[PDB]
């Protein structure tokens, strides 16, 4: 019986929490601008070839096989699409002359392996990406 009021939050905590929230919002603004810049630059920059050079369709020498078709028919548009996996797969679908061979028989490098830059030559590159950028794993 006879309830009494009991403080729960610190006496000076409220204003400190307010200013911490304001500073966090400003830091989030800065990080958002940085992440937008990095995402746009990643999307525009050319990436590595997303096809495995160790499987049946992409095994021939660069002077034969599907590589001749790629170099003489759809070479121009690969630079415009910047070798991203989704546009290259869509272009391979639309070009024909391959049929279901891009899915029933072909294979592609994983999602985090196909996002490496044009020249990497190293496995640990995917872990060298900036961490303060909140681009959700898009360099």
């Amino acid at each position: 019986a006879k309830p009494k009021k009991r403080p729960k939050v610190g006496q000076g905590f409220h204003e400190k929490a307010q200013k911490w929230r304001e500073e966090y919002l400003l830091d989030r603004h800065r990080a958002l601008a940085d992440s937008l810049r990095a995402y746009v630059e990643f999307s525009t920059s050319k990436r590595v070839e997303p096809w495995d050079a160790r499987f049946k369709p992409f095994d021939r020498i660069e002077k034969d096989g599907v590589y001749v078709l790629m170099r003489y028919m759809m070479e121009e548009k690969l630079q415009l699409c910047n070798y991203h996996h989704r546009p290259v797969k869509r272009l391979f679908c639309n070009i024909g002359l391959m049929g279901p061979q891009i899915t029933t028989k072909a294979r592609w490098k994983p999602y985090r392996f196909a996002t490496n830059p044009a020249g990497t030559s190293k496995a640990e590159r995917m872990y060298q990406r900036d961490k303060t950028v909140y681009t959700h794993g898009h360099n």
């Binding site: 939050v9 610190g10 905590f13 911490w20 919002l25 400003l26 603004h29 937008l36 959700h136």
Partner: protein
């Protein structure tokens, strides 16, 4: 230990498993999760054509609201008018004293951090401070 009236009335019953997306008390601790590519599709209305929620407008002959609703989406007038904007949050409230144009079109709950990283060193007890130090949250 959260202190509320419902804490005594109800029981946590351990780490019980709830139906998908049907927890009783919603606590969107992930509202402030940053994602630059998904900036317009995270914790926001799915369609760009949708109007702003009712909570962004005044309906009746009001006399005044102490704080605006969290779902109220920040607009240009919020910063341009230079008025007073407050959002209810732990512990008491968060006031927008730093009007910025980078948060136009985003919900105030998305802008405000629910789970504040700051920890009060005042109300913490001896055992609780020892626990926080052991966890590493406190020196």
């Amino acid at each position: 230990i959260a202190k509320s009236a419902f804490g005594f009335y109800l029981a946590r019953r351990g780490q019980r498993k709830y139906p998908f997306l049907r927890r009783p008390h919603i606590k969107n601790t992930h509202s402030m999760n940053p994602s630059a590519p998904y900036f317009w599709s995270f914790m926001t209305a799915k369609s760009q054509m949708a109007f702003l929620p009712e909570e962004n407008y005044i309906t009746g002959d009001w006399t005044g609201k102490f704080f605006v609703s969290k779902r109220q989406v920040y607009t240009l007038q919020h910063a341009t008018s230079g008025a007073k904007v407050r959002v209810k949050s732990f512990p008491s409230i968060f006031e927008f004293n730093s009007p910025s144009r980078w948060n136009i079109g985003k919900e105030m709950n998305t802008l405000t951090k629910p789970r504040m990283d700051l920890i009060d060193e005042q109300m913490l007890t001896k055992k609780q401070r020892l626990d926080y130090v052991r966890a590493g949250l406190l020196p």
